[PDB]
Amino acid sequence: GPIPEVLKNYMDAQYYGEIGIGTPPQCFTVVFDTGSSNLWVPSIHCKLLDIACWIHHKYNSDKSSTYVKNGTSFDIHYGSGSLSGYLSQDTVSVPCQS
Amino acid sequence: GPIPEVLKNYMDAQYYGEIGIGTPPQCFTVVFDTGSSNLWVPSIHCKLLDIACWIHHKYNSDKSSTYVKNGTSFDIHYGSGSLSGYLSQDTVSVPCQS
Amino acid sequence: GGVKVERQVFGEATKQPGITFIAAKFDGILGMAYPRISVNNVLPVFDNLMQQKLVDQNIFSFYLSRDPDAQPGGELMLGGTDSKYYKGSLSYLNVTRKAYWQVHLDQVEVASGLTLCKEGCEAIVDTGTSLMVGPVDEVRELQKAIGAVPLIQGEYMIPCEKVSTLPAITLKLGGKGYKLSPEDYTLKVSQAGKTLCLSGFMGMDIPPPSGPLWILGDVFIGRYYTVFDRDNNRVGFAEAARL
Amino acid sequence: GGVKVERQVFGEATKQPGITFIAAKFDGILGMAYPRISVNNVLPVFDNLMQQKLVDQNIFSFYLSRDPDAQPGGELMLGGTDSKYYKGSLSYLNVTRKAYWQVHLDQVEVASGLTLCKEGCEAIVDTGTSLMVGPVDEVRELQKAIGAVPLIQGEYMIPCEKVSTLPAITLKLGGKGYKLSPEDYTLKVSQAGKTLCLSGFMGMDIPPPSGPLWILGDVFIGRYYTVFDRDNNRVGFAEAARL
Ligand SMILES: COc1cc(Br)c(C(=O)N[C@@H](Cc2cccc(Oc3ccccc3)c2)[C@@H](O)CN(CCc2ccc(Cl)cc2Cl)C(=O)CCN2C(=O)c3ccccc3C2=O)cc1OC
Ligand SMILES: COc1cc(Br)c(C(=O)N[C@@H](Cc2cccc(Oc3ccccc3)c2)[C@@H](O)CN(CCc2ccc(Cl)cc2Cl)C(=O)CCN2C(=O)c3ccccc3C2=O)cc1OC
Ligand SMILES: *[C@@H]1O[C@H](CO)[C@@H](O[C@@H]2O[C@H](CO)[C@@H](O[C@@H]3O[C@H](CO[C@H]4O[C@H](CO)[C@@H](O)[C@H](O)[C@@H]4O)[C@@H](O)[C@H](O)[C@@H]3O)[C@H](O)[C@H]2NC(C)=O)[C@H](O)[C@H]1NC(C)=O
Ligand SMILES: *[C@@H]1O[C@H](CO)[C@@H](O[C@@H]2O[C@H](CO)[C@@H](O[C@@H]3O[C@H](CO[C@H]4O[C@H](CO)[C@@H](O)[C@H](O)[C@@H]4O)[C@@H](O)[C@H](O)[C@@H]3O)[C@H](O)[C@H]2NC(C)=O)[C@H](O)[C@H]1NC(C)=O
Ligand SMILES: *[C@@H]1O[C@H](CO)[C@@H](O)[C@H](O)[C@H]1NC(C)=O
Ligand SMILES: *[C@@H]1O[C@H](CO)[C@@H](O)[C@H](O)[C@H]1NC(C)=O
Questions:
Q1: How many CB pairs under 8 A join A and C?
Q2: For residue D167, what is the DSSP state?
Q3: Domain C1-243 belongs in CATH node 2.40.70.10
Q4: Interface contact D23, partner A, CB < 8 A
Q5: Nearest CA residue ID for atom 21, ligand 4
Q6: Which one of A53, C66, C107, C173 has the minimum C-beta count within 10 Å?
Q7: What spacing in Å lies between the alpha carbon of A62 and ligand 5's midpoint?
């Protein structure tokens, strides 16, 4: 019945688990955040030199058979930070299940 | 005769090798920089929450039998960054030799 | 055995300025509040999941370990509760405003006698916030009572030798007491033999339309296993299992 | 078999602001220029080493690999040269100003016909700089010739399909030509199947007392094994061994 999702705990400051986006699933670690309602991950279309882009897992639409193009710009303003990019549509797996 | 010091190469952007400071030697990776003349490493007396302090190896005077207190404030201004702290005296090993 | 939420609209981030996204050990954020506060009016993951009827109970629960070294670090249960991570029985509070996971907080009492949120206030249960967040003016006074010194960005420090002798903080929710001991509301940030005790209370004023709000963060959830019910729009708490 | 420089005065850093020190994979910096530019007039590591007579030859040499995956990433030889990392024989230039490892650069010529540092200029050999650095105005014109687009902080980009057809850049030092091919002066920053070609030339004006200066960085040293001689205050170059 219920789906268990294991979380990692970094220094009691950040809790995150692994999800998948695409067919075949590409793995990303996300914060299951009850203080917000959007889902986002780094894109393959981010500047390689930008510290945040390079050090994290990037989503690549071309590797997915279930990807549906959207393209609408998005901007999110959290308590601690801001990010921008664009919208896309694909299947999300919980856990990743590669 | 000559002392070989192996260097790590990170993405052709940063080359660094391992040294030791203290008796017994505490290991740190440094940039053998011909564009400057000072030697410095992170202190154990830096703010744990500061990203730069936490992620790097910190020097602890109390663990060294050859440490000689100085205390003079220092400030360095490189092309890409600035740092501050205080001066200390101890033995430097090349390579670390734990 | 997992779950696959098809046709899910998400963001492909191209710009992530500031140190937050360099300090983050995770890749992104999966938002789990109501469709109401969704940017670009995108249907949330749990909402699309409920619609695809992938769960029998439209609830999700969190176990957050308060020992960084403790394995697993936590557990999110989708479509149920995990009875092996909580002690006793669940206690429920209704969601006031269905945007965040907002509840009515009756008051915050310190064992020393100090009272904050004296005549009641609004609180959100936020898994993606590590600390307890309160208004700047109320938290400054709270941190005077615990004897904590100001640090930066609304955060505070306590000398670890003083932490044990601190008073208990109690949060009144659903008429029930939710006791946090000094150990529960203070983070022991240790490394290289250096230990810095950080206050689990942070001072931040959330402006309207959103606030003012108290944020019951990982400090609270780590002590009290939380249940998020979209069927009955309520929040459940039970003392979490610990060693 | 190593070396132990006793009574060495160094810095214990307590504050490291900016992204540089978060982006750095190393802990600190061991400066290897002259006592002349030492902050707080602290005796340098190589200077204290020469004084303790721990080397027979008061020279240090660098091998820097230009293949990130190539092991070792480099080699610093203290008290000699490593003949197995260089091809042929060393060519020497005298140090003009004994602060940085400064030399006279006769000119910078591009195979397309473009000339920078037309009547000679001053250059430093800097292991702690990844790129070649030139004055803002001269580098902008150079990057027009290679067809590179501006990026940020004086850096540039080239579409990788164009890199092979680019002209060779030659640096005239000691009356001798020091040829860098397009592959030698362009960094292939690859990840996740995405490749971005970055120009190995950066535009930055160094102000007096220090500059203006050209900085012969890791791009140059990686191609030409460098010898730093404190006995005869000269710099040696030899084509580095590569596969
Ligand atoms: C030190 O303690 C912390 C303090 C804070 Br303030 C956060 C934090 O920003 N949490 C975010 C999630 C997040 C995002 C990016 C990175 C994250 O993790 C890292 C953080 C730092 C370094 C590395 C990683 C976490 C939200 O869960 C907070 N919330 C809801 C409450 C809230 C509500 C309103 C307002 Cl003004 C402000 C807040 Cl804090 C949000 O960010 C809300 C965002 N938001 C909406 O979603 C929304 C919809 C419609 C209207 C307005 C809004 C709105 O403001 C985290 C903390 O530790 C983990
Ligand atoms: C993108 O390419 C790069 C560009 C630069 Br500009 C550097 C760089 O700053 N190198 C530093 C060493 C260093 C310090 C901190 C971090 C480092 O690595 C990282 C960098 C980024 C992110 C992560 C890690 C490297 C020096 O070797 C430069 N130099 C001498 C030349 C020079 C000379 C003069 C002036 Cl104004 C400016 C310069 Cl760039 C210095 O920093 C000189 C510092 N300096 C002295 O030592 C000194 C003594 C007396 C008077 C004045 C000075 C003086 O300015 C590095 C680069 O890639 C590696
Ligand atoms: C890219 O994906 C987007 C969705 O992720 C697409 O746009 C959105 O589509 C959804 C439905 O799939 C709409 O949601 C509905 O909104 C109504 C009304 O609420 C709001 O509507 C307007 C829209 O202009 C908004 O401005 C107001 O603030 C309203 O509050 C609800 O009643 C429904 O229940 C449902 O939530 C989104 O409104 C719509 N967004 C936008 C910005 O238009 C988009 O079409 C996709 N693009 C492509 C090219 O396929
Ligand atoms: C902490 O360690 C410091 C050294 O790392 C100590 O201070 C320095 O001590 C060295 C010698 O050990 C001095 O260096 C000499 O300087 C002279 C003259 O050059 C400069 O002198 C003055 C100093 O006030 C300076 O302001 C001028 O700009 C001169 O250029 C040279 O001729 C020598 O060859 C040698 O290099 C340093 O000058 C001195 N620094 C300072 C700031 O005084 C310090 O004493 C130690 N502290 C403790 C408490 O032990
Ligand atoms: C929640 O609402 C239900 C009715 O749906 C009511 O029985 C219960 O007393 C309410 N509890 C709180 C804490 O608001
Ligand atoms: C370097 O100086 C020596 C004298 O010490 C001289 O023989 C030689 O020609 C000079 N070379 C250069 C390139 O300046």
A1: 284
A2: P
A3: yes
A4: yes
A5: D41
A6: C107
A7: 49
